[PDB]
Amino acid sequence: GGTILVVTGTGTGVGKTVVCAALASAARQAGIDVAVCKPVQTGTARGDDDLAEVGRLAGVTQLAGLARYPQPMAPAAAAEHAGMALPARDQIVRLIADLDRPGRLTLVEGAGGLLVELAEPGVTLRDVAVDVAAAALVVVTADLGTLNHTKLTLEALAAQQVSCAGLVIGSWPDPPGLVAASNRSALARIAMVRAALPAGAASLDAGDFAAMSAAAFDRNWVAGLVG
Amino acid sequence: GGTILVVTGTGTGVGKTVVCAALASAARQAGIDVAVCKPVQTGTARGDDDLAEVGRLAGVTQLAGLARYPQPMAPAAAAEHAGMALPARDQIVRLIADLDRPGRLTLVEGAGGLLVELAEPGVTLRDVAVDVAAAALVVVTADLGTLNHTKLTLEALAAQQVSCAGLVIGSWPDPPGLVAASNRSALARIAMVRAALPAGAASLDAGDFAAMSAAAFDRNWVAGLV
């Protein structure tokens, strides 16, 4: 197969979706075939659709989903409120494996944070990464409190020997304050920061978003993701 | 000795200080001698002295601390901005051990979340809990995202065999709402929910805060702490 990369975050609303679109756009511009997967999507009644947003920002047409739940809550609670059930652990893995192909970068965007239950009992994106032997890209913020959450997430990855592909700051302000600048330097000592997307990147058009994506990441790292 | 409880949280601004005061007030009314220790404190330029708030809200007099930084940043960052290093690991452990005495409940409030550096090099409240053989009370919120942060914190505690004394919701909204009501049920499935302090409890006068605290916690669990 190719390269599978789960994209998680320190929590919800930290920029998982825009980072998936940014990395997808950068990989596409490098000639890499890209598929984006969102196996569990909640909040569809509120209009949330991360796959649709990734295709809007990065032009990705190879988009794969599985479970969709109306309420903007945890998958376990959103499924319970709709009378539905969570998908099986093997259903999520099968969805990802069918996308895997040589020369392709497959991004698997989680729901919420790393330890969110995606399947019963207590199956998380961390367990999924072990099943498909994928490294983990962790989206973080630059705000107060990000250092604790980033350390907690990377320690959880190491507990199951899930490699950390690095960090991405979901929103980087201009200009940065004392806290944001201090956080970015401290985050760089925790792990390698692959990119810091400028604030409001999700509001850019396709042209501006592609230029931002190509400049946000190191092309040597993006090209090295897929052989 | 007595009972040492470190009081951490899933992050910053989750209610660690008001929970320390609430548990201190409930334990005092149960006849338990209470000491509160905030070894490292930041953001004092804004005027936040967490020990002073604990003394005003719960009436605790044994209030111990080692360092106060004015900048509202992480202890390591605020220390670097002021050009002054953090306390030593032995300073924090020995201060807490000297506070501990039979019949006393000693609460150790951390700065920020569990894995925040409180002493060089990279010493956290989790390391301190191991040295003083203390269990951990985890302050959580009721908002969206608390489930992942709580699970991450509890896993970090278990990774160092630090026992979890339960959870406390730092601010219970009114009206709760769908997410908050669902989170409270899910949090109880993860760990024991010792209390959920009502929103705005940090602004109560000393008398009103004492009445809230006595009703927020189970009187039998508080009495069994020492």
Ligand SMILES: O=C(O)Cc1ccc(C(=O)[C@@H]2CCC[C@H]2C(C(=O)O)C(=O)O)cc1
């Ligand atoms: O996780 C991170 O990014 C690192 C980090 C570490 C510590 C804090 C704090 O300590 C806050 C800062 C301002 C006041 C402090 C607050 C209080 O004293 O009321 C608390 O204890 O949480 C915030 C962030």
Ligand SMILES: O=C(O)Cc1ccc(C(=O)[C@@H]2CCC[C@H]2C(C(=O)O)C(=O)O)cc1
């Ligand atoms: O940790 C917790 O308390 C549990 C938890 C679990 C999942 C979510 C989500 O999935 C959010 C809900 C609404 C939109 C979702 C968002 C997106 O779809 O873009 C995301 O994935 O973060 C939020 C909280």
